[PDB]
Design a protein around this nucleic acid. Structure first.
Lengths: 185, 124, 262
RNA sequence: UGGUGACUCUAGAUAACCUCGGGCCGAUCGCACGCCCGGCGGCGACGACCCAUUCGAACGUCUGCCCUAUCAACUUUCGAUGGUAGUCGCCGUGCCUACCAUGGUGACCACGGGUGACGGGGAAUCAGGGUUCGAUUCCGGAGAGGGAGCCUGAGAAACGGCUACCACAUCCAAGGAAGGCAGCAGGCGCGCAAAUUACCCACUCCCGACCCGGGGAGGUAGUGACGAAAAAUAACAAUACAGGACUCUUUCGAGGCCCUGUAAUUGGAAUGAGUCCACUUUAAAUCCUUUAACGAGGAUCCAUUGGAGGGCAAGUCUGGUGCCAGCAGCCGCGGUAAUUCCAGCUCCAAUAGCGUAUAUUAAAGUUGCUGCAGUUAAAAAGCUCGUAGUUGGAUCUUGGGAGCGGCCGUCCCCUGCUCGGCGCCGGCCCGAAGCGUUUACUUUGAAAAAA
RNA sequence: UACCUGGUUGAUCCUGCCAGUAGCAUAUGCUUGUCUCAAAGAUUAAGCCAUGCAUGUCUAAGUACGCACGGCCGGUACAGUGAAACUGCGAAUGGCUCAUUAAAUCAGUUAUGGUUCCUUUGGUCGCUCGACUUGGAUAACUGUGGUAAUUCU
């Protein structure tokens, strides 16, 4: 008897065939395009989509104007719309099945930090996130999984604290400026 | 530039205190010590710093903001009455015995071996 | 076990208290009292969890032992006292007075009242028996044994009793058309007029209850209280008025309030 | 009197009893003190017979459990099923006695045996069905080395109580005495297999005469790749180069305004692994978060684990061995050009993880209800009768009345006889009880711990 | 994601199994930078256990003649804090483990009009027609011990 949680679940599934050429080379096409680091980062997104895509199958069996469906369905639609994956024009849950992995990879912080143009590449973007240079509404985000809410997209900029902003200039410059005055004399 | 906005402000007449969640803005420099917040909250709410008890600070990641919980009592006679002993001891106005519970228990079990006034002659 | 249990596990605690599952192993086991374990709200949970005056349980000791908390008329220095349905919690130094009536969602609401209102409560009678020398006795839901009640008071009625004396004033007969707070099951907290009591001899008597919006439901009789004559209640009701607007209605009424208030 | 669906209920009346191992009816204690020609009282504490209430407990109802027939009859005058009257027990009961009756259960699997069987909430897997697991933090049960007996108490057949016996074992001046970690640590042993003889009552609650004491319950650290979540191991430019847009050239070549990729080429800008003042954290610390200062070019601050014949992603490369050594889940490789061994380079896969053995799930439509098969691949009894089991022909109400939308759609009606409200000169229309072929089925409702 | 793939043949189509394939939970091998949660002597032996700890407790309110400490105004005893000790209450909860147990346990579902119940809560507590407070102890304390030895007495 203890006051611990225990509740924890996996966020991915390993695929059945470990050596489908067609899969191996489509998941590396995803990793290159969007600058992820291993196939777990891809199977993580694919698994979230599969759970969404499982819940959608479950609600489409139900009769139209079912109270559980109308509540649960709109709740699922407003969530996908809120993260910028689905459209407000298209929020109808037969479109949720016509929805794929690139739509979720586009909304992760790494790709937004790149496609706003305050990073130079997708690999530079992770560097800028990992090295806590970027923020979202005065919150410095260390983590490139961070799925950007649709309203919360425009508030991605540099940290006030980082040298890319109006921040205290970094370790290499400050050591090279001190070595530069130690070099001049 | 260390600022304090208070929040969830409540006046407990039944513990004779104000209590509030303390949002401290400190961008650029570290978590500011409790003493400074206690002095900075005293001049805010027009009281002495001695009847204020401000604890349990968790600085948000990134670190331009932290949150602790605060209490302002009416008198030190109330403070010393209805405050937990460890949080008084942080203000250096309470001392507990140095003797660990291993000593107190070995004393207690030795004291059960003897009956009557001999129970006094266990610790020398 | 080889004798009565003195502990209660936090995960075993009744759901309506809304204790978490990470603060401790144990919940407060309610002190033996007028109300049942599964139906009472202990004083500690009404002080540190709901009103949030205290933080810890040692704080609730430092409030209740100062003899401030006056549950239905009498001061209580027991942190795990079972305060239950209709009981009036009078915190005197704040000048506040609370009646424990169920929110339309299962949990007990914090429902403030006027001190003029606090002077009386309303008690469901459990049974009537005739005492030692033809003396009619009268046991209520909070076990307030009353000797010499009005003879037209029957088994499932309610009685408006004055707390300062403990004597009946007026009684509501269990009749069709009378208001009903439902105090058990899925329909816990629901308010509505009693439509049809359906008698099942040997089994439990179900009782249909029509709502104020017309959303008629039913309950087992034992879970049904009466709070008013016809449509007019004898208490002040908590906001929502015991209707239970649906999850769809709750959602769009949260959306409406979230945008309109700002 | 009042009450139930039902009392031999509760209450009333009569007559008595009322245990000496004994029902109650207060010889109890605190604060504040008063009024009253010595008497009257406030606020509590504790106590107390009985009723009720809460907390339960106990014994009963209905239905539900794995394998086994190389377990087919079992139970019974040392109680088996029932009757009657007691005894015992908190009470209902073959619980137990006495006398009776001869029952009770079973092919709808009793009875016996087995179980690496505490049950359940649950766990894994998973198209739909399923299969496997559940010692394990919540519920309920059981036990404290094995049996047994009991004291106290509201509650125990208690074991951090006692009494024996059995087994084991401690101390002994040898007469005696003491023991029970399947509590927390820790030790031995057993094993493929599992952590510190740590700090603390601050949280959570519990116990007590109790705002105050105590709690290996619980919390906090330590060990911890059981497992889960996030997530570094570099990014960017200038150059050599190469591939792809264009004017242009048969080919070469020219330009790079545009791209894209690689070289221990060079260049600064980076940020945390670590180091570390301080605050914060906290019972006191730790970790995290915050934050001075240091902290990176072979960014040596150095990513492994397994593979590279097929299944199965990736060398017909080089050196060694020569059916040896070995690899090899299977098929196979090894006897002198080894794509498979032993290494080098190289490439692939997953990646802070990856391999192996074993149980188990899917794959297994290779246990088949969904859904398998049975001429010849394994398989239909030699043949027939035959009882339980399973399955079982057809048949028993329909037409229209009332209303709407543009001939077709969606609604209300096609049982009857004691008590009062929309009314009327004994009853007419209607409201509320109670009897109404009996079940499966379907739909709704109540009720159903959380996790 | 409701999936198959190699292997009997000279070659073929089958039945059919072996092997592969992914998860899971125990062990284990090699390797391991940061960070958040976190299982962890169940499996064999419900085997045996050195040592330390794990259940004690006081209010204004049962009992204070320990000067153990201490207030002064005493002769109408009793200031107060207060060890010990009697008393009361608890120790039947919690914790551990899963050996036994197969209509048992357990689960849902009812019954208790068949029972018991410290405690809390509310009743009840001049209902009986018949001393301005009583009696004997015992502990703590003091003293005398005995046993090699016990929380012995």
């Amino acid at each position: 008897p203890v006051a611990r949680s225990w509740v924890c679940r996996k966020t991915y599934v390993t695929p059945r065939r470990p050596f489908e050429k067609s899969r191996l080379d489509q998941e590396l096409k995803l990793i290159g395009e969007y600058g992820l680091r291993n196939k777990r980062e891809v199977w993580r997104v694919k698994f979230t989509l599969a759970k969404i895509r499982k819940a959608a199958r479950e609600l489409l069996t139900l009769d139209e104007k079912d109270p559980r469906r109308l509540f649960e369905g709109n709740a699922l639609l407003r969530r996908l719309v809120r993260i910028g994956v689905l459209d407000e024009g298209k929020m109808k849950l037969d479109y949720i099945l016509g929805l794929k992995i690139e739509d979720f990879l586009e909304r992760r912080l790494q790709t937004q930090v790149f496609k706003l143009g305050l990073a130079k590449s997708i690999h530079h973007a992770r560097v800028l996130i990992r090295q806590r240079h970027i923020r979202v509404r005065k919150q410095v985000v260390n983590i490139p999984s961070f799925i950007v809410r649709l309203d919360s997209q425009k508030h991605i900029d540099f940290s006030l604290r980082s040298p890319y902003g109006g921040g205290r200039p970094g370790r290499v410059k400050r050591k090279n400026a001190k070595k530069g005055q130690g070099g001049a004399g | 530039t260390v600022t304090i906005r208070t929040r969830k402000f409540m006046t407990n007449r039944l513990l004779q205190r104000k209590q509030m969640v303390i949002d401290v803005l400190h961008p650029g420099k570290a978590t500011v010590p409790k003493t400074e917040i206690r002095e900075k909250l005293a001049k805010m709410y027009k009281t002495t710093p001695d009847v204020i008890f401000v604890f349990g600070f968790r600085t948000h990641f990134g670190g331009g903001k932290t949150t602790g919980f605060g209490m302002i009592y009416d008198s030190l006679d109330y403070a010393k009455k209805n405050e937990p002993k460890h949080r008084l001891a942080r203000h250096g106005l309470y001392e507990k015995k140095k003797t660990s519970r291993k000593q107190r228990k070995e004393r207690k079990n030795r004291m059960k071996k003897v009956r009557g006034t001999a129970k006094a002659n266990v610790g020398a | 076990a080889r004798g009565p249990k003195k502990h209660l596990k936090r995960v075993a605690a009744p759901k309506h208290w809304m204790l978490d599952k990470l603060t401790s192993v144990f919940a407060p086991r309610p002190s033996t009292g007028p109300h049942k374990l599964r139906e009472c709200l202990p004083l500690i949970i009404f002080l540190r969890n709901k009103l949030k005056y205290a933080l810890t349980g040692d704080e609730v000791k430092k409030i209740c032992m100062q003899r401030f908390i006056k549950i239905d008329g009498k001061v209580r220095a027991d942190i795990t006292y079972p305060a239950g349905f209709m009981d009036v919690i009078s915190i005197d130094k704040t000048g506040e007075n609370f009646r424990l009536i169920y929110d339309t969602k299962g949990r007990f609401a914090v429902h403030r009242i006027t001190p003029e209102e606090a002077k009386y409560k309303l008690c469901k009678v459990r049974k009537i028996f005739v005492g030692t020398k033809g003396i009619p006795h009268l046991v209520t839901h909070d076990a307030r044994t009353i000797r010499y009640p009005d003879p037209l008071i029957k088994m499932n009625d309610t009685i408006q009793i004055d707390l300062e004396t403990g004597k009946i004033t007026d009684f509501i007969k269990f009749d069709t058309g009378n208001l009903c707070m439902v105090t058990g099951g899925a329909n816990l907290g629901r308010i509505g007029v009693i439509t049809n009591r359906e008698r099942h001899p040997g089994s439990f008597d179900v009782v249909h209850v029509k709502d104020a919006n017309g959303n008629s439901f039913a309950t087992r009789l034992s879970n049904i209280f009466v709070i008013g004559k016809g449509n007019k209640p004898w208490i002040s009701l908590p906001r929502g008025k015991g209707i239970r607007l649906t999850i769809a209605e709750e959602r769009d009424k949260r959306l409406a309030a979230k945008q309109s208030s700002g």
